[PDB]
Amino acid sequence: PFDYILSGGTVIDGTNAPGRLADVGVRGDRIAAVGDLSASSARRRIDVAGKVVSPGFIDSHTHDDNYLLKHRDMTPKISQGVTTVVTGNCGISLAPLAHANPPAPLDLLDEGGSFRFARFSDYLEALRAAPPAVNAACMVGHSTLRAAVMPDLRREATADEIQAMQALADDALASGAIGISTGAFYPPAAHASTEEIIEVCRPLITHGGVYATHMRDEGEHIVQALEETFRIGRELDVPVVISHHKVMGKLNFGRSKETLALIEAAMASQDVSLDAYPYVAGSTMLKQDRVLLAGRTLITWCKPYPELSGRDLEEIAAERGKSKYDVVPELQPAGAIYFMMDEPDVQRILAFGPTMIGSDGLPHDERPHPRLWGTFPRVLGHYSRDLGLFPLETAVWKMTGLTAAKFGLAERGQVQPGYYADLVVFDPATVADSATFEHPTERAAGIHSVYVNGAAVWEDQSFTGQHAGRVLNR
Ligand SMILES: [Zn+2]
Ligand SMILES: [Zn+2]
Ligand SMILES: [Zn+2]
Ligand SMILES: [Zn+2]
Ligand SMILES: [Zn+2]
Ligand SMILES: [Zn+2]
Ligand SMILES: [Zn+2]
Ligand SMILES: [Zn+2]
Ligand SMILES: [Zn+2]
Ligand SMILES: [Zn+2]
Ligand SMILES: [Zn+2]
């Protein structure tokens, strides 16, 4: 007999096909059958009439590396329907690195002495011993490797350092990491050459993972940054994933037409993927960057002046008698939200066929960007239902089947017999993001229940206590 059947709802199976009325039966951690299951014995037959049963949402872009250890409930994500998170993005991974003062933006994962894992395998073992509520597909970050190997980061790596980093990256992949990410836009890796990146990532073709990247520039020189990314993909001969695609800065508004055309052309000759979050503001370390600081900038957290969390940088700067750009150093380390994107570009990028959905939530932030709590329902409700940017089955595919395919997560992302029972039951008419910039932690509406490996993790708007997540391998 099945453990339970979710009966009477509409199944949107993750393959980009219109929903159809069908029951979903689960036995243990697997979807046992899909269709009219009235004749199948089940210990429970749960009525979900009026709801949609879809695969669990896969968060293609997270910084949940440490949150998975400190807050196993993973409420910001499971409350949105997320069942799997991809970690270690933008060259930022929690492991391998033993340092009590890692360089920004690595501090985005730190809760104080969190960087204690000398080997990537030790990190994966900690997750397996005390599993989080969601599955974790983990990448190792090139900036973390630089911090672990290089005494001085303000220069290109020597052959010896490249070899040491490559050795760590190879060990991580062998241990279960699903790829390697970079973020040369940031200080720890700004001096890294394309050659250094390519050689450190050679283990990918051997162990079979993806190369994920926060491109070197996402504004005026985004074309050069895209070309560097495509070149790396060709030299390594592995799939590349472009993180949080956007065009930033007033002088670049509208250029998503140009960037998407370049990505589409590249996809015709090499393996390219991309993800994006559904908002017009980004968030990361507070940084002296003329473009990031050009628009409205809010502080998410601040070490030297904790009381500044939630404040407007323009006001802080004015009252300190300095420009926004000049006041930054005295406030570091800190985090911020930057309003430097345009709605038309965000919509174009989201609608572009291949674009997968990633929240880019920064879970440790005192006053976070709302994407942490509202990304997936914002795509299903606001964009699909209310704006008609894409039909619901395509919105679902963009956070399930497409993502599982690009990251190589076998037997996940689709409501198919034999696949893992990572599922979401949501109300299509009411699903919606509730989090706003003013109240960034409000729980999404319309998310009835969430299952991970067959176990309910979210029910009655609360974590069930089921730590059902698993460390995944590509
Ligand atoms: Zn915490
Ligand atoms: Zn190896
Ligand atoms: Zn080389
Ligand atoms: Zn990034
Ligand atoms: Zn090839
Ligand atoms: Zn401006
Ligand atoms: Zn004031
Ligand atoms: Zn000056
Ligand atoms: Zn990110
Ligand atoms: Zn709306
Ligand atoms: Zn538990």
Automatic annotation (TrEMBL):
E.C. number: 3.5.1.81
Amino-acid positions noted as binding Zn(2+) 5 in the UniProt annotation, renumbered to this chain: 195, 199
Alphabetical list of CDD domains matching this protein: D-aminoacylase
Binding site for Zn(2+) 1: 61, 63, 90, 360
Record carries keyword Zinc: yes
Ligand binding (Zn(2+) 2): 71, 111
Entry binding sites for Zn(2+) 8: 382, 386
A GO term, aspect molecular function: hydrolase activity, acting on carbon-nitrogen (but not peptide) bonds, in cyclic amides
Top-level class of the enzyme under EC nomenclature: hydrolase
PANTHER family: COLLAPSIN RESPONSE MEDIATOR PROTEIN (PTHR11647:SF1), HYDRANTOINASE/DIHYDROPYRIMIDINASE FAMILY MEMBER (PTHR11647)
Name of the protein: D-aminoacylase
